[model samples]
Target: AWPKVQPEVNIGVVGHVDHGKTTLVQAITGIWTSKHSEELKRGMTIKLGYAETNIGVCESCKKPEAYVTEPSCKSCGSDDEPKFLRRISFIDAPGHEVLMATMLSGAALMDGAILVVAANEPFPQPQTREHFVALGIIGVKNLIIVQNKVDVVSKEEALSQYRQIKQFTKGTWAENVPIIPVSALHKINIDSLIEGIEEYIKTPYRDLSQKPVMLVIRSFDVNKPGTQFNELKGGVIGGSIIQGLFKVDQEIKVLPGLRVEKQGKVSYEPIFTKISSIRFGDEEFKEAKPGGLVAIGTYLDPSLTKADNLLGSIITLADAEVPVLWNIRIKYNLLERVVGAKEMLKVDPIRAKETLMLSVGSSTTLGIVTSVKKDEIEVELRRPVAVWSNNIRTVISRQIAGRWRMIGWGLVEI
Candidate 1:
């Protein structure tokens, strides 16, 4: 049975490719993240994947085993009910270096994160370092380092890898974080890892008394092709609520909602709709509270949300004042070098008329540098972006290897 209050926590799993992020999440959530056919053949995660599970302590063992998804305990087959813990939704991000933007977007929805590193290999792989930096850039402070694949390595090798991790994160924000070693394949030391998560990744206090804000991550049409028009359900928006609460049948407005082209001109208009339903973890809820991933069934046409077309849009109460930005003045900083690039080349300064990719709140758009002044740059975006003063994270990326590589982040100068 689902909780009445919908106690949920959103966390992310990140690492380099082949570092067992998917395997580790599966161990925790009992769901395989890489289920797409192309992902199966490619042997990698192509897009963001999500799964929800509960971390509970078994009655007999008195240890946290991945429960809630399974009826019986994972450690001991005790019929006694386990003590309920927080409901956790895991956002499994692609670890491929080229998908740094995708990973950054996923980071926006997380309250805390688990950075996985393989004990069988050297610590701090390129993407491993890049992922940690992305977490830092996005302002995700609650972190737990996972030292995985210990079953395939000797104790001495594992110790050596641990030291490398300590050195790698020495001066970074994760310097004082807890590092737990486990083998997802064999489920070794999983209880210890869960304990660490419980202790380190405490849920951040949220203001439910404020306005509701949900950063759209995934949207879809959940209807079958042969379904009749009258029987069709509304579009579904899946994301995490950063603050406030949403109840069923609440009239809401999705900002910068739908893009339209008319009279040879393009514009974005807000879409007003009613929340038909709110769902969490395969169960319907009367109200969706802040934290965890939720799917809000809306009265919008399915075409609007199909293929995540509405991603990066903000959903708030109807008639609420929203910030619509076209010309953005950003107090920005640049990285010493391009991250997630093949070469460690020095990053060039922003120049007028130069085009750069910008990632903000799960949305990506191209911006032309209109002017560069000292530490700030004025950019004219190809499309409008919605900005929040309290939670500002504008990432700047340059085109390298035909992909947008992260350079730095900026504060939206309102």
Candidate 2:
């Protein structure tokens, strides 16, 4: 029964590196987010980690503790079956400082996030602070804090970490976000973690009846290293549908699609293709909406889709989903302080003719400031981008210390 359902939300796991992001996911879903051969050698995740799991609750158990990933109540061995609570997808975003661009791109698909922290470590690691700021600018959605590694800490130390987390998240909303302490290693309090997720992050608002638009987060070839050409599969693109519905065999177009060079002139052209299948997790579905992450298998060649060639493109029905513009006007806001840098520094006003990196939807591209006014700026994009017109969030960045540091964020306009 659960196999036929689409995930209702996307809850991202984001925090500092080696802070147990993947471990917490494994503890909850029994699926490890860290994979691929290169990741085993480096022993860390570089690409966005994706996983989907169903949530269930045993009616006989107490609140929070009643939650479980399994259908049966194994904790109590009770005869009563758990009522399926919800189905959701987890995005284990890259948490290192250098992967900020990838994180921002993934943020576009996140409905909410689990801000993970290590109990044995100090509060506000560089990426922790940086990710918090990034999430704040991305519509300030619901957030839950998971203090993992509590098994290795003293009561005094755990409380200290909790206080630090609460104090650090003093945001504009000022909502009392819950902080659940769990030893993800021993799987202790893992059920409670699921309960927190089920309650705090209910599926947010979505107008599924609108135009069908999707953000391409990861695209790759389904073919293995080597195989018979007759059995080779087509490219598959994975992402969350922004709105509307997608059915198999529908014609779709990917915008800012392919880079073209003719007569020494460069341009972008959309790629048109037909959907062969729609998949959510391990199950294949006939239709999908603006809920969990879904992979769309297309007739496009593997070489065009592999290695994230379509990473930030807009995939939608055959219509103008967004306009491809070389210039964009936006209203922006600079943060009080730069959070990503090792040394906290005050953010200065954006100047004219400065180059800034902007993350719009899933695409991260550059913009050169052409004009600046009171909280308004005009930028000409280095690479043409097809952007949504509905005030989509855009992350603005500047090169600091030879790194692209997030200085502020803006709302994409005209």
Candidate 3:
């Protein structure tokens, strides 16, 4: 029997809104990334969708297939189970222009990435270009270009699209990246895509000796509305461990934990809780290492974690030195034009009263410009963030054409 294990690596699927990122994930994982009603109705991803699968090879067919909740081969109809290749976690990032913040947040969880470009459409969609820039800014070097929707396009058109892709990536970090054509709807060339993943995305080196730290992407209260007091389960936090290891029954502290009012000034206090369980897939583990997404069940008040109220929080070992934030002074850079905007608008200089959305890791917060200086600006955040160092890199977005468009990035100094 195959054991459910933590994914060996986390890979992200990102591109334009309708470029089939979700379908591509489903093709690889046998689970659709989007499940929310809104996303299902809208036919687009609005949040980061996660799924994991083991890439296995059928000895009889000599091809790779994604083994999700089954072991039998769908191609050869062989009852013999396939040999396990590697477990992979896929982060399906939203491609909507307005949801670039969510995509940027998902980038923090990715060790590698798959940039999906629809062959049926012209190359270099708006979000497609913006996503590449985001990956470059976030330092995600390992990448594969998926020329998807090939089944809908003619061979000549696909070749033309491939040329466009090569030109678009010229002189960029992805210049030498592998490009594979596939039709996710028909499940074509998935084995080639898996081969590309195996060739390009190697497992990253992690230092288990470091202190345990996890960036909380989702938190939930699992209790039903009418559940009895004793039968109710506690809050659960789900995310990937960035470093070190976590064990069941260990004391953990969540930073920027809860908003408090003290002397009429907003303050944040860390919340201490005990980890009751650790879950990966359907299996529970006594201990977990840094690699893939995990759910940490905690003995905390369920109300505090309902509906991702505790998202963008940090979980670390109890009594660990976690960063406290009030104001952020960052050396900022502005792009010439706003990305993901319907119209090309020049980025204006930051003013003292201008408000901007700042993305710090997986957290997004609104900040008001308190002071403006040459090449630097100090922002007072509406909600605080937890960061280990003052020199944390943050993605900055400005309101353009009634929408928040990614402008550039900054390094927070304080």
Candidate 4:
């Protein structure tokens, strides 16, 4: 049975790398907006980006972020948020190694997920299979299977892939799911995809008159002062509204700092101070319910808001506990081999590896697993960081040849 819609909802994107997750979003929304500057430079959506497709319900926020005075998070110091106005939002996770922390944050916030797999590929690809297992275990059942890149494959292959995918989910919630074939580059099946989504929006709970609680996702600045002609200005915040209604002039509290806002704006300073007004596409609502987009006003500066911080609720460092770290190890497999030896360990790099980039839930650090335990390993981070995982997060890995030859795995503890 299709799940019921409520005052709020959340949707996420999941699939194998380069399987067209971002491309499908571009085709469906008819916009090339998900590419972050860094992603554009690398030619892929590497870590995190979001887009709102004008779908879902309203949200009421009793407690908002500290600097949400203006329409943007600039007041609070967030950056690059999409204009969600009246539609629902979509979160994009980069398919690169070491981005697992960001991916975990996004997935943990999902009300549902859209799984993308190329029609030309087999169903059991590592990431495709692994993400399916993760979502299932996390209880994300509302799903849409996108057999993308049909234009590159023969009809027979596409159908075969679909069947294999079905077989792949014989014992899962997605067993009888709708698998939509798409050509993101060709703009095929995008509308059908939307229609399929519309059907799933029907549900039993559909109202939000009480206060709402939103799990903060990403935050940034809108426009920083003293920027030269060479710098990009402005910031944005992205997250799904979980429960409540949000309106103009409604005072809200920011977490950790317990900051308050009077109004919210689209591009004002200190982002969520208050609600100057709310915009949904071309319409303005004094109050929108849960499940819709959010842009608030504030007095806080962008530097104070930073990424990975929560809004709309009062909080503190003690409230945001650092997830206990654990030891992990794995054996090699055929899939790990296909990922390329040097690229395998490239997924989760030790800070000492000199790769120069590491991120998690908007927080990045430099560190290395110091000890290899019988059933665990010790990691030495350059700085104190926070994470949450129960056991092992088994991912693929390999060694750099001609320099440091090593053999590892596609599996490890998270």
Q: Which candidate number maximizes TM-score?
A: 2
Structure candidate 1, residue pairs in collision: none
TM-scores of all predicted structures: 0.93, 0.96, 0.92, 0.59
RMSD of each: 2.3, 1.6, 2.5, 13.0
Q: Mind giving the per-residue lDDT tens digits that candidate 2 earns over 181-252?
A: 998889888877888898888898887778888998889877877787677798899888877888999999
Candidate 1 per-residue C-alpha lDDT over 334-406 given as tens digits, one digit per residue, 9 for 90 to 100: 9888756656778888889999888888778898999998799999999998885545878999987687788
Clashing pairs in 2: none
Off by over 4 Å in 4: 1-9, 54-87, 201-210, 224-237, 257-285, 306-414
What's the lDDT for all of these models? 0.83, 0.85, 0.85, 0.50
Off by over 4 Å in 2: 1-3, 228-231
Candidate 3 least-lDDT 10 residues:
62-71
Query: 2 or 4, which is superior by lDDT?
Result: 2
What is the lDDT for 334 in model 3?
Answer: 81
Order the candidates by TM-score, highest first: 2, 1, 3, 4
Candidate 4 displacement at residue 183 in angstroms: 0.9
Please report the TM-score between candidate 3 and the true structure: 0.92
